[PDB]
Design a binder for this molecule. Structure first.
Ligand SMILES: *[C@@H]1O[C@H](CO)[C@@H](O[C@@H]2O[C@H](CO)[C@@H](O)[C@H](O)[C@H]2NC(C)=O)[C@H](O)[C@H]1NC(C)=O
Ligand code: E20
Ligand code: NAG
Ligand code: NAG
Ligand code: NAG
Length: 534
């Protein structure tokens, strides 16, 4: 061995770079391949392990981002472009980034970030995902993987070995397997690996907790604004097939067999599949994505619900939670009456239209049931109440409630649960006030962006970010976000009986119980029974 930026792994030697972080410095190994480029005949196929390389791999720069749809709704607007690919897109995108504190540790806690983006997008190279602040502040080895999104990572034709589906999830598993096998050489503890992600990434984390082929590869898990049982997180094999065939019809493909559909989809250029990607949705809706994980019977032995009921999942500690206004982002992009530059006061007519889009798989009685649940008949023509009520509908149906279901089901067999409710609006948030505490805006606090003075955050927002970063890191290290024998306020353990959680904001810690039970009893217990009877 030689320098601190030189690591000899089971795959080969890797050369990193010294990165500046808050006056100090740490190491960074960017763009390390954990799989063979899924290009050509391997498109849609399961990931193959990266053949070991000879010589030194240059890991000083960020890798390419996977082929995905690019947000062009508000050009120049940072609020929407901060989520867009900041590196060149390519199908050769299966790489991982590692931030190692300096001096290189011997055996410290490891955290693997799994980005979100509805399974149709996302990048590990984003600014809000820069793990250098967390790695440095909390003294952890921050890893951020990457996986194929869109059709490339989730096209599903059950029965076929050329495109079985869930390969995007297998990409994550191979990265986790690479972390299990090589993180030791970077000073990380393979015995203490915490996987954490947001939205689609949080659902992925929960999917790895459920899938037996992924359970042994990590210790603990953190789920942010995401759950494996989210209505948008997965589809049946029949629906996945239907969407795959529909994708082919949109590209003038031969649909007589799977062998011919796939051959066609493989000859087409990346952007060709992306341009027609949305055309396969079965309904006119919001918070719904085309190619997502499928219940194949392999990655997922049986239905997610049956697995959750039987305790068929990894027993360990989990830390999860949701943001206050999760639905705003989606109403702004597809619901009539919403716009980035207006207060977006919603009319009774637009409210009814919003409900239709929010619960696509519902009939008329179901639509009336949802409306009844979120309507104040004493003041039904209130524009602000209609706007906020619709925001609650999208967030509760798509994020909050399904997560609350997973929380209650998991805790019964689990070994420790910690629930949070992030309800703080960043003072420098570029999005309109009507959106509130937006889906994905806790990430900046998790990654410690508020510590960087040049980002215009307040003092209390830095204190909050430091508090959150420490909760996450301490939990990853021990299984409890609370510092042993500390004088600070204690974050209660979530139990099947008490059901406690905390608010994650700038004010002193406050403890509550039964996070949105009123609305979630409706979404998890009543509505599904109503739609089922009719
Ligand atoms: C998490 O799992 C650990 C290990 O199984 C539990 O600790 C045991 O708890 C039982 C009952 O209180 C004790 O009799 C054992 O002595 C404990 N074992 C150890 C090694 O400490 C722990 O209770 C579980 N925590 C939760 C919240 O379920
Ligand atoms: C056709 O185009 C469509 C475009 C979009 C949707 C549906 C569509 O059709 C149905 C959505 O539902 C997306 C709406 C936003 C959701 C939040 N993200 C940013 C973010 C990224 C990663 C984690 C957290 C936040 C920006 C787009 C975009
Ligand atoms: C790639 O490696 C070279 C040295 O071989 C060095 O300039 C740096 O680490 C990387 N250069 C570029 C342009 O990415
Ligand atoms: C911080 O404030 C300055 C002055 O208004 C502005 O120009 C800059 O863009 C802001 N930085 C960020 C990251 O918003
Ligand atoms: C769901 O609906 C189907 C069709 O009506 C019915 O056979 C089944 O029993 C229902 N499930 C429950 C739990 O009621």
């Amino acid at each position: 061995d030689h320098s601190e930026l030189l690591v000899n792994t089971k795959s080969g030697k890797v050369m990193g770079t010294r990165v500046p972080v808050l006056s100090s410095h740490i190491s960074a190994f960017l763009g390390i391949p954990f799989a063979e480029p899924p290009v050509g005949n391997m498109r849609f196929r399961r990931p193959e392990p990266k053949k070991p390389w000879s010589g030194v791999w240059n890991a000083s720069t960020y890798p390419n981002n996977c082929q995905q749809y690019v947000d062009e709704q508000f050009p120049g607007f940072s609020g929407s472009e901060m989520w867009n690919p900041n590196r060149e897109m390519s199908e050769d995108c299966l790489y991982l980034n590692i931030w190692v504190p300096s001096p290189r540790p011997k055996s410290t806690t490891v955290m693997v970030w799994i980005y979100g983006g509805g399974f149709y997008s996302g990048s590990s190279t984003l600014d809000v995902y820069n793990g250098k602040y967390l790695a440095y502040t909390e003294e952890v080895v921050l890893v951020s993987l990457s996986y194929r999104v869109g059709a490339f990572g989730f096209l599903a034709l059950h029965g076929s070995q050329e495109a079985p589906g869930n390969v995007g999830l297998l990409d994550q598993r191979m990265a986790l397997q690479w972390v299990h096998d090589n993180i030791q050489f970077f000073g990380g503890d393979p015995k203490t690996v915490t996987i954490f992600g947001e939205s689609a990434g949080g659902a992925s984390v929960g999917m790895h907790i459920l899938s037996p082929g992924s359970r042994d590869l990590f210790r603990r898990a953190i789920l942010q604004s995401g759950s494996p049982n989210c209505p948008w997180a997965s589809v049946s094999v029949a629906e996945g097939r239907r969407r795959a065939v529909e994708l082919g019809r949109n590209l003038n493909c031969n649909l007589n067999s799977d062998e011919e559909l796939i051959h066609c989809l493989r000859e087409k250029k990346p952007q060709e599949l992306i341009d027609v990607e949305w055309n396969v949705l079965p309904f006119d809706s919001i918070f719904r994505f085309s190619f997502v994980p499928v219940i194949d019977g392999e990655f997922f032995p049986t239905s997610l619900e049956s697995m959750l009921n039987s305790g068929n999942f990894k027993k360990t500690q989990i830390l999860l939670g949701v943001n206050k206004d999760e639905g705003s982002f989606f109403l702004l992009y597809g619901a009539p009456g919403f716009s980035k530059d207006s207060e977006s006061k919603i009319s009774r007519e637009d409210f009814m239209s919003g409900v239709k889009l929010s619960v696509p798989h519902a009939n008329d009685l179901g639509l009336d049931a949802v409306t009844l649940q979120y309507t104040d008949w004493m003041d039904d023509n209130n524009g602000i109440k209609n706007r906020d009520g619709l925001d609650d509908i999208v967030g509760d149906h798509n994020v909050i409630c399904p997560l609350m279901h997973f929380v209650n089901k998991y805790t019964k067999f689990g070994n420790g649960t910690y629930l949070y409710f992030f309800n703080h609006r960043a003072s420098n948030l570029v999005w309109p006030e009507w959106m509130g505490v937006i889906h994905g805006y806790e990430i900046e606090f998790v990654f410690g962006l508020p510590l960087v003075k040049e980002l215009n955050y307040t003092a209390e927002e830095e204190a909050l970010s430091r508090r959150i970063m420490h909760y996450w890191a301490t939990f990853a290290k021990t299984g409890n976000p609370n510092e042993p024998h500390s004088q600070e306020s204690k974050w209660p353990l979530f139990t099947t009986k008490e059901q406690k959680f905390i608010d994650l904001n700038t004010e002193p810690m406050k403890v509550h119980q039964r996070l949105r039970v009123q609305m979630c009893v409706f979404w998890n217990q009543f509505l599904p029974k109503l739609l089922n009877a009719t």
